Ligand binder design. Structure first.
Ligand SMILES: Nc1ncnc2c1ncn2[C@@H]1O[C@H](COP(=O)(O)OP(=O)(O)OC[C@H]2O[C@H](O)[C@H](O)[C@@H]2O)[C@@H](O)[C@H]1O
Ligand SMILES: Nc1ncnc2c1ncn2[C@@H]1O[C@H](COP(=O)(O)OP(=O)(O)OC[C@H]2O[C@H](O)[C@H](O)[C@@H]2O)[C@@H](O)[C@H]1O
Ligand SMILES: Nc1ncnc2c1ncn2[C@@H]1O[C@H](COP(=O)(O)OP(=O)(O)OP(O)(O)=S)[C@@H](O)[C@H]1O
Lengths: 102, 400, 390
């Protein structure tokens, strides 16, 4: 959509198109809008990585939506369970020195 | 001040209604004379003021002898100027046959004064009327937005848009000619251009590789239309009209030809000239009586009986929806609720008070204008709000 | 007292059976001189009262000289009147065929009074009979609802509703003309309107509406016969100026073999055609399967209708729903020797042992107005007044 001065992505699976339409590709600007968050929460956002199919977009997440309830990290041996904790933990400390972690 | 059925609304319930309304089968627009004030035009009372300033001697032979106008209206500036020229043409035509030479001069001399005053107010650019590319100037910036937004949101298998208007000026044409759009107005040809009413039913189509076109209905006429021989009506270009007749009108004095012009609704008693005016109202009704229809109004003062009749009759069909813009609701509600106001106020008010969820009125002075109507209409997604074209054309022209 | 064939029910037990019977293919309704009271009608008894206490002097010959009526039922105020009219027409015809004077005049004097008292009751609005839009009024408010819902409760590809009638007035026409639906009665034309029986087999259809049929059983006020042997229909504004006004405001004048109401001149091979062609359609509608028939207003004083509705019940998919207000007043009289066929038949019906006969009684809760409400359900004025004044 397009509302006031930018775009927003709704996630509801019912707007089937009409015949004689025209299909088009998606550029690298209609893709951030999809894999992006609100822009008032940027002060409360941390960077984790990028998209793996293209390796162009960056992914951000809200701290007060991650660490509100509990969080599950699952994975077999030798694939990176301990390289994501030392990354999610040395960031909240650099952003909120008034925080208790154990 | 927004009202739907008497009750009030908020901007976010209104903007979410306009979008639902613009997705329907048939869509339309009806403009007026105020829409053309942001370009260099005028209003019907600002015309009468200038008439009775410069010509106060002919203003007695028109209220005393022939009974053509009333003093209350002449004082309050509430005269219809498109309904008086017709009557004067009737008088002159009668006098020609009755052979009363004492009465033809006194009508030529007061028609030459009315046409000179209504023409001057419709050029919109003065002496730069006969030149080219007058749609690039910034005065015509929203007339383009209107067209582009009306077109850019339609789907395959959906009728094209229509635009009715009471003005007799060239703004929409000057704008479409610069966007690269085509408008159908009932004419065909270049060396002899003639009226064919059977081609409001046509459309375009592509062979191998189209839907950039719209319909325009002008209800009172235009300065580029005229009549040379008994049976036909011709259209010309601005540069050609200015050189044929539109110049003597302004500069020369005591110049009047006869039944030669088709603006505004003047020579309505012939049978080759009213055939042109009637088809428009015909098609207006035939459009306003379809199912799943929506109509936006802006710039219209509601001083006509037949159009109001048509609209009120149309509102019986449950699938017709309307939207109106009148920036004097407050200044009229009281003037009509105390003792009474004027027919326009009474009519416009009768609609505010009903149990209808398919009517709507809008006020707020400078908040119900054209530059703000053009902004409540949704803007598409893929349409580019960026111009990397001119930076390339500049380099192409700089190359040397 | 919702008796249902040797049992008893309640309001909803009835109000669901009706919804069940409304889904059938063949739906039919039957109406008599009862449902016409709310609009200004009179039963068969009031007209006899009026004739008695308005034309007493000539009432004797009917009992002393010609023996058309019985003094007992005359006093009891239960006497059939249209059969009397029919027979008097026969007497007049014989006395005019053989050239005799006194018996001719003596019957030309009686026909007038009878037709007068029988027309006044059916005018139904006084002197607003020769005027327009008489269906916008308030008396004709429940017929419109009846039609609207009986039509709306239909499936696509289904048959059309059937309405039989024993009255001879214009209410169901005035009402449909207000709604905007098309009725079929077997007539066609405007400047010369004629009878075509095979028109009952037609039906409309669209190319890019809804309608119904109407079977009268006793005629109407707007049908008549001219010097040539064809039967014509006419509008009220025209009939009023043609004959009715004189009927109601002249003391002695008669035109024989002209009018068609009520079962009067059946001894003419041109007039009995149009009567028989209705009863045989009634029969052929009954004999169909998956049919329902709602009876509201009829007094069951007819040999032939009784016989037909009786024989109709052998095959099981024909449902009947009678309405009868004064039921216990007859249950408590059949115990003794006194009783009339009207009540004997209805008690015999309620004394059955299958779930089709569904007699109903509430004294005043078995009436047309409640009959209507028992059924399911599926700004113009302001705008038109605004346009008017504008
Ligand atoms: N910038 C603006 N934007 C929008 N509306 C405006 C603006 N400025 C003024 N207005 C409104 O524009 C209106 C000006 O009304 P008038 O020009 O006299 O009426 P007409 O052009 O329909 O006159 C032609 C008719 O007259 C005969 O009856 C024939 O039948 C014709 O149909 C005011 O209400 C202003 O509030
Ligand atoms: N408002 C009302 N709503 C419903 N029913 C009513 C109402 N008022 C009275 N009734 C009932 O309406 C009934 C009136 O009965 P009658 O008018 O004598 O019978 P008919 O109209 O079939 O007479 C025509 C026959 O006469 C010849 O014999 C021919 O053969 C005809 O077939 C009463 O029982 C009331 O309970
Ligand atoms: N995103 C990454 N980029 C580069 N190397 C990675 C990445 N994720 C994991 N690795 C490598 O994977 C190796 C082992 O991963 P570990 O951190 O041991 O995961 P793990 O063994 O599942 O976690 P444990 O069992 O709690 S020690 C390390 O040497 C990392 O260098």
């Amino acid at each position: 959509k397009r509302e006031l001065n930018g775009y927003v992505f709704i996630s509801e699976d019912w707007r089937l198109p009409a015949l004689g339409s025209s299909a088009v590709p998606l550029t690298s600007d209609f893709l951030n809008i999809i894999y992006s968050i609100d822009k008032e929460e940027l002060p409360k956002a941390v960077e984790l990585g990028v998209d793996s199919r293209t390796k162009t977009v960056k992914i951000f997440a809200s701290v007060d939506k991650l660490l509100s309830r509990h969080l599950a990290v699952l994975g077999s041996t030798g694939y990176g369970k301990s390289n994501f904790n030392a990354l999610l933990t040395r960031k909240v400390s650099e952003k909120y020195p008034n925080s208790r972690i154990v | 001040s927004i009202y739907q059925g008497g009750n009030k609304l908020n901007e976010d319930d209104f903007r979410s209604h306009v979008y639902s309304l613009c997705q329907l089968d048939n869509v339309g627009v009806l403009l007026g004379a105020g829409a053309s004030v942001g370009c260099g035009g005028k209003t019907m009372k600002d015309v009468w003021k200038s008439f009775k300033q410069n010509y106060p001697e002919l203003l007695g032979a028109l209220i005393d002898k022939y009974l053509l106008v009333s003093q209350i209206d002449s004082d309050n500036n509430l005269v219809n100027v498109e309904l008086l020229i017709d009557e004067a043409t009737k008088f002159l035509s009668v006098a020609k046959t009755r052979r009363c030479e004492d009465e033809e001069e006194e009508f030529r001399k007061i028609l030459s004064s009315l046409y000179k005053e209504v023409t001057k107010a419709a050029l919109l650019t003065g002496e730069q009327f006969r030149e080219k590319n007058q749609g690039k100037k910034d005065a015509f910036k929203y007339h383009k937005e209107l067209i582009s937004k009306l077109i850019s949101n339609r789907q395959p298998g959906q009728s094209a848009p229509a635009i009715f208007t009471t003005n007799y000026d060239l703004a929409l044409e000057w704008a479409a000619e610069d966007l690269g759009i085509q408008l159908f107005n009932g004419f065909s040809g270049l060396h002899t251009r003639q009226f064919y009413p059977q081609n409001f039913d046509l459309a375009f189509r592509n062979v191998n590789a189209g839907h950039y076109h719209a319909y325009l209905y002008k209800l009172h006429g235009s300065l580029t239309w005229y009549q040379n021989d008994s049976l036909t009506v011709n259209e010309v270009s601005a540069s050609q009209a200015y050189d044929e007749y539109i110049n003597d009108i302004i500069n020369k004095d005591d110049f009047y030809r006869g039944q030669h012009l088709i603006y505004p609704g003047a020579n309505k008693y012939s049978h080759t000239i009213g055939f042109v005016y009637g088809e428009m109202f015909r098609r207006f009704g035939e459009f306003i009586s379809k199912p799943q229809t929506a109509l936006f109004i802006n710039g219209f003062g509601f001083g006509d009986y037949h159009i109001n009749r048509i609209i009120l009759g149309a509102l019986l069909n449950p699938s017709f929806h309307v939207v109106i813009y009148y920036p004097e609701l407050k200044e009229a509600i009281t003037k009509v609720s105390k003792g009474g106001g004027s027919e326009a106020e009474k009519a416009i008010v009768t609609l505010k008070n009903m149990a209808f969820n398919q009517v709507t009125v809008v006020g707020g002075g400078s908040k119900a204008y054209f530059n703000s109507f053009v902004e409540h209409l949704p803007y598409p997604v893929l349409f580019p709000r960026d111009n990397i074209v001119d930076e390339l054309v500049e380099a192409i022209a700089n190359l040397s």
